[PDB]
C-alpha cells in the first residue's frame, strides 16, 4: 500500500494532466476571448423573472378566456335553439341530414338510414389536427349500443345544426381552435371539425365502446364533486353471477370518479367492513381507484345480510370530517340484489333532513323482492337502477350522474361556469389536451312557466379542447438557460405544464383512457422547500424563493446540487398557477443584434453542408425558426431546408422571428471562428478523439466529421443531458458512456468531457456554450497505466460509474455502474457518506409485461 502522499501526488499529476488536456484541446479561454471581443455584435438582456411569469400567465389566461367565450357562445345558442324546438315522430319526409362519423369512405349510397340522409364529406388534410378534417359541417358519433334512427336520436340530430353554424363562426373568429363538441345526454357527440371516428369506423378486433356521457369532461361538467360510499352487499345470496356483476358494476362505477371526488367501498354481511386498506373517504385518483378495484375483485360472498349494520357504517363514514373531503354531494351506492328490509329507522336516525342521497342498484338476474330497494331510493333523494346482465353495467352509472345534476340546473346561471379538465389523451389523437366544459340546460318552458316535466336535467355538456402544445407556445423557453423552464399546477397539485410531462398514460402498478395526472412532487425531486412552494402555489398567491436543490439530470443517471429561483404567480380567472424555474446564472442572456442585412449572410454561408472540413460537423436544433420550415428527424434535411430558407430571408420580415434566427447565426459564427482560429490551425491532438462545442442557440459543430458519425446526442441542445449537466458544475464533467448500448459504443466514440464558458459582459456572468472533448480511451489508458497495476486503482465519477480501471478487463465493461461489478466497495463507500443517493419513482415509464 503506497503512502497517502504518494498516491496523492499521483492524483495531482493525473488531474493536472486532464485539466491541461481539456483546456488546451477544447479552447475554453479562447472561446471566452471571442465572446468578450464581440460585445459589439450583441447586447446582454435581463430575464426579469417576475415580468416573464406575469406575461406568460396573462397570455395563458387570455387563451383560456378565449376558449371560455367560445363555450359561452355555443351554450347560449344550444339552449336558445332547443328551447324553440317542436317534438316530432315523422322523419321520413322531413329528413335529418348529418354526417355519421362511423361511415365508409367508399361512395356507397346504401350506407344510409330510413329516417336520415347521410352526408358524404370532402376531407382535406390539416397538420393542425394531423388527420382528415372538413370544416363544412360537424360529425356525429352515436354509440354502437344506441340506435341512430330512434325518435330521441333524430330529434337531437335535428335541433343541433345551429350548432354547426356556431361551430363554424367560432372557428372563424379564433383560427387556432381544436375540437369543439356538444356531448349530448342522449349519447350523441357532435364535434365540429368533421373527421372519421378515431379508429373504429368498421374494423375487426376493434369494438367501439366510446360513450360521450362517460368521458372525464362530461362527467366533470354534468355535476359537482361527489362523496361516494359504495356499499357492496357480499352476502350468501349474491354469490355466483350476481357477485361477478356486482364487482364489474363497482369497477365501472369507480371509473366515473374524478380527482375531485372522494370514494370508499364498504361491504356488509351481518356486519359491515371496508373492502380495502382504507378506512375513510379517500381521494379517487388513479392509485386509490386501482387499490379499491383490486380489493373489490378479491371480495367473496358469504353470510346473512343486515342492512342496518351496513347503512350505519355508510353514514358513519360519511360523517368523518377529520379527513380531507369534497364537502358536497354525499352519496351512498347500494349494490345489493333484493331483500325485505326497508330499515326506515336507520334512515330516520342518520339521514333525517336528507343531506345524503341513496342510490340503490338491484344487480343480477334474480327474483327477490325489490320493494325496499326501490323505497330506499325514494325516501332519500335517490334513484333505483337495475343491472340484470353485463351490458347494463355501463349505463346506470351514467344515469346516477344524470340524477346528481338537478340542483346544478335549479341554480340557473350560477352553475354555468367553465371548468378545465386534467391533462388527458384526446380520443381523436392529438396527445395531451385539456378541455373546458359548460353544461347546457333545458329552456323549453321559461317565462311562460309550464309543467317542467324533465326541465331539471341538462341537455348535455359543451366542450372545447386546448392542446398542451398551444400552451407551450405562450411560455417560450429559448431565452432561458436549458436548466430553466416553466411549469404550471392544478389546485390538486397535478402539473398542467412541466418539462417532465410526456405524452403517455400514468403507471399505477406492476403490470400483470385515464387522465395523465402527474403530481408536482412526483415530476421532480421532492424537497421540503419544494413542498412549501407547492402549497404556496396551490393557494393561488404570488411569491419567490431562491434555494439549493437536487436536480436530477435529463438522462436520469446523475444528480447535481443546483441553485434555483422559483418565481410564481396565479393565472388570473383560472384555478392554475404558473411558475418559472431559473438558475442564478440564467438571469442574463444574449440578444443577437444583427441588423446589417449582410452580417447575417456572412455568418450564414458557413453552415452549408459542403464546407464540413474548414468547420466541423454541425447539427441544427429543430426549433420554430419559422412557419415555412417544417422540422424533421432526418437532421440533414432540416439543415438543408434551413439553408434554403436562409437564402431568401429578407422578404420574410413579418413572417419569422429575428431573435432565434439571429441568435443561431451568431452562434454559428462564434463556433466557426473557433474551429478556424484554434482547431483548424492545429488539426490534430494525440490524446483527444473528437473536439466539439454545443451552444444554447443550437449550433453543435463537432470537428473530425468522422467521430460526428458516432455522435448520437440530441440535436436540440436544450435536451442534451451532458450540456445541462455541464451548466451546473463549474468544472469539468465526465459523462460515462452508456454500457451495452448497441451503436457508437466507447472505444470508437470516447468519453465526453465538457466545461461551460464563463464570460463577463459589463460585469454580467454568462454561460452561452459548453466546449466538449471526446477523450480517446486508448491514449488515456496509456497515460494511466504508468501506475500500479494488479491491485486495482479505479476511476469513478458522480453516480459511481466506471470510467476505467488499471485491470485492463474492467475497461472492457467501460461505462458500467461500479456496483454491478464489486458492490461491497461502494456500499461501504455510501456508509462512509462519500456517496449519498436518492430513490424516486417514475410513474410514467414503460415496462415489460410480467407474469
Amino acid at each position: 500500500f503506497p503512502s497517502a502522499v504518494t498516491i496523492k501526488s499521483w492524483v495531482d499529476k493525473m488531474q493536472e494532466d486532464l485539466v491541461t488536456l481539456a483546456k488546451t484541446a477544447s479552447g475554453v479561454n479562447q472561446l471566452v476571448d471571442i465572446y468578450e471581443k464581440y460585445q459589439d455584435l450583441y447586447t446582454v438582456e435581463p430575464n426579469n423573472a417576475r415580468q416573464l411569469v406575469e406575461i406568460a400567465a396573462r397570455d395563458i389566461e387570455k387563451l383560456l378566456s378565449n376558449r371560455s367565450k367560445a363555450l359561452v357562445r355555443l351554450a347560449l345558442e344550444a339552449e336558445k335553439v332547443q328551447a324553440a324546438h317542436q317534438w316530432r315522430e315523422d322523419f321520413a319526409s322531413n329528413e335529418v341530414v348529418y354526417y355519421n362519423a362511423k361511415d365508409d369512405l367508399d361512395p356507397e349510397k346504401n350506407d344510409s338510414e330510413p329516417g336520415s340522409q347521410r352526408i358524404k364529406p370532402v376531407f382535406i388534410e390539416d397538420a393542425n389536427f394531423g388527420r382528415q378534417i372538413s370544416y363544412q359541417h360537424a360529425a356525429v358519433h352515436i354509440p354502437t349500443d344506441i340506435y341512430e334512427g330512434s325518435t330521441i336520436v333524430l330529434n337531437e340530430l335535428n335541433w343541433t345544426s345551429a350548432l354547426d353554424e356556431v361551430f363554424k363562426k367560432n372557428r372563424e373568429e379564433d383560427p387556432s381552435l381544436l375540437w369543439q363538441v356538444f356531448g349530448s345526454a342522449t349519447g350523441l357527440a357532435r364535434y365540429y371539425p368533421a373527421s372519421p371516428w378515431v379508429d373504429n369506423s368498421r374494423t375487426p378486433n376493434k369494438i367501439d365502446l366510446y360513450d360521450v356521457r362517460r368521458r372525464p369532461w362530461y362527467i366533470q361538467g354534468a355535476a359537482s364533486p361527489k362523496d361516494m360510499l359504495i356499499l357492496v352487499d357480499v352476502s350468501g345470496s349474491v354469490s355466483g353471477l350476481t357477485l361477478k356483476l356486482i364487482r364489474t358494476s363497482v369497477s365501472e362505477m369507480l371509473e366515473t370518479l374524478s380527482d375531485d371526488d372522494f370514494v370508499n367501498v364498504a361491504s356488509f354481511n351481518s356486519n359491515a367492513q371496508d373492502v380495502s386498506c382504507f378506512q375513510h373517504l379517500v381521494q379517487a385518483n388513479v392509485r386509490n381507484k386501482k387499490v379499491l378495484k383490486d380489493a373489490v375483485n378479491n371480495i367473496t360472498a358469504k353470510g346473512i345480510t343486515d342492512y342496518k349494520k351496513g347503512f350505519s357504517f355508510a353514514f358513519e363514514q360519511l360523517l368523518n370530517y377529520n379527513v380531507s373531503r369534497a364537502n358536497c354531494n354525499k352519496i351512498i351506492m347500494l349494490f345489493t340484489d333484493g331483500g325485505e328490509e326497508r330499515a326506515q329507522e336507520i334512515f330516520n336516525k342518520y339521514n333525517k333532513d336528507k343531506k345524503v342521497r341513496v342510490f340503490t342498484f338491484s344487480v343480477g338476474q334474480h327474483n327477490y323482492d325489490r320493494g325496499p330497494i326501490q323505497w330506499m331510493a325514494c325516501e332519500n333523494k335517490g334513484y333505483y337502477y337495475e343491472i340484470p346482465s353485463i351490458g347494463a353495467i355501463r349505463i346506470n352509472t351514467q344515469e346516477y350522474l344524470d340524477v346528481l345534476g338537478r340542483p346544478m340546473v335549479l341554480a340557473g346561471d350560477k352553475a354555468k361556469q367553465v371548468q378545465w379538465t386534467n391533462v388527458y389523451l384526446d380520443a381523436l389523437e392529438l396527445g395531451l389536451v385539456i378541455t373546458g366544459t359548460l353544461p347546457v340546460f333545458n329552456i323549453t318552458g321559461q317565462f311562460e312557466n309550464k309543467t317542467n316535466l324533465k326541465n331539471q336535467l341538462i341537455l348535455g355538456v359543451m366542450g372545447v379542447d386546448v392542446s398542451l402544445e398551444d400552451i407551450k407556445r405562450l411560455t417560450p423557453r429559448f431565452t432561458l438557460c436549458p436548466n430553466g423552464y416553466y411549469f404550471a399546477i392544478d389546485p390538486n397539485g397535478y402539473v398542467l405544464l412541466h418539462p417532465n410531462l410526456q405524452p403517455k398514460p400514468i403507471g399505477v402498478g406492476i403490470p400483470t383512457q385515464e387522465p395523465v395526472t402527474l403530481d408536482f412532487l412526483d415530476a421532480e425531486l421532492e424537497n421540503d422547500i419544494k413542498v412549501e412552494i407547492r402549497n404556496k402555489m396551490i393557494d393561488g398567491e404570488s411569491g419567490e424563493k431562491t434555494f439549493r436543490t437536487l436536480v436530477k439530470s435529463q438522462d436520469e443517471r446523475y444528480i447535481d446540487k443546483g441553485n434555483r429561483t422559483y418565481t410564481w404567480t396565479p393565472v388570473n380567472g383560472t384555478d392554475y398557477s404558473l411558475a418559472l424555474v431559473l438558475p442564478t446564472y440564467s438571469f442574463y442572456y444574449i440578444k443577437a443584434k444583427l441588423e446589417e442585412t449582410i452580417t447575417q449572410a456572412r455568418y450564414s454561408e458557413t453552415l452549408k453542408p459542403d464546407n464540413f472540413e474548414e468547420s466541423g460537423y454541425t447539427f441544427i436544433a429543430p426549433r420554430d425558426y419559422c412557419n415555412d420550415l417544417k422540422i424533421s428527424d432526418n437532421n440533414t434535411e432540416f439543415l438543408l431546408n434551413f439553408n434554403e430558407f436562409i437564402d431568401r430571408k429578407t422578404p420574410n420580415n413579418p413572417s419569422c422571428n429575428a431573435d432565434l434566427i439571429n441568435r443561431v447565426l451568431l452562434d454559428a459564427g462564434f463556433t466557426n471562428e473557433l474551429v478556424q482560429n484554434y482547431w483548424s490551425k492545429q488539426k490534430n491532438i494525440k490524446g483527444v478523439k473528437a473536439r466539439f462545442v454545443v451552444t444554447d442557440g443550437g449550433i453543435t459543430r463537432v470537428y473530425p466529421k468522422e467521430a460526428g458519425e458516432n455522435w448520437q446526442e440530441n440535436p436540440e441542445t436544450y435536451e442534451d443531458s451532458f450540456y445541462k449537466r455541464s451548466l451546473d458544475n463549474d468544472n469539468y464533467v465526465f459523462t460515462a458512456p452508456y454500457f451495452n448500448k448497441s451503436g457508437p459504443g466507447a472505444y470508437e466514440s470516447g468519453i465526453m468531457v465538457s466545461k461551460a464558458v464563463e464570460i463577463y459582459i459589463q460585469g454580467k456572468l454568462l454561460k452561452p456554450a459548453v466546449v466538449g472533448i471526446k477523450i480517446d480511451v486508448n491514449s488515456w489508458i496509456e497515460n494511466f497505466t504508468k501506475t500500479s497495476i494488479r491491485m486495482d486503482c479505479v476511476i469513478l465519477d458522480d453516480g459511481g460509474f466506471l470510467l476505467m480501471a488499471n485491470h485492463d478487463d474492467y475497461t472492457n465493461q467501460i461505462g458500467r455502474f461500479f456496483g454491478e461489478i464489486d458492490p461491497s466497495l461502494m456500499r461501504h463507500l455510501v456508509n462512509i457518506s462519500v456517496y449519498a443517493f436518492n430513490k424516486s419513482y417514475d410513474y410514467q415509464s414503460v415496462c415489460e409485461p410480467g407474469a
Binding site: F1, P2, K8, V11, Q15, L18, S224, P225, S276, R287, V291, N329, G382, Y384, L404, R406, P407, L410, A411, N452, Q456, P491, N492, P505, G507, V508, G509, I510, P511, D519, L521, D539, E556, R557, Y558, D575, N731, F734, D792, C793, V794, I795, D797, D798, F817, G819, E820, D822, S824, L825, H828, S833, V834, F837, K839, S840, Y841, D842, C847, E848
Partner: protein
Amino acid sequence: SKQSCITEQTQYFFDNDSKSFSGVLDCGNCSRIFHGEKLMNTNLIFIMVESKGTCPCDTRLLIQAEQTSDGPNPCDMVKQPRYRKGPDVCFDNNVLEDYTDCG
C-alpha cells in the same frame, strides 16, 4: 405490447465536500484496504483499493437502473396526504327539486 409501470430509479452523487477518504473495507472474514482521492476541479474520484482475488463479498448488487417496482404504499399516503384545495363552489340540496322520480 408494453404497459405503463411505476419504476423506482436511483441516482448517486458526492455527498461530502472533502477530497480524501481512506479506510479498510470490512469484507467477510477478510480485509480490503482502500483510499479515495477526489481529483480537484473535476467530478472524478480516485479509489485506490489494494485487494483483489480475495474472498467474495458480492452477496447482492447495487443495480442503479429503472427497476420495475410497486409504487409508494397507497394505504400509507392517505393518512397524511399532500395538500390539496377542492373546488370553491358546488351545487347540491336544492329545495325546488322534484324527488318523485325514483324509478
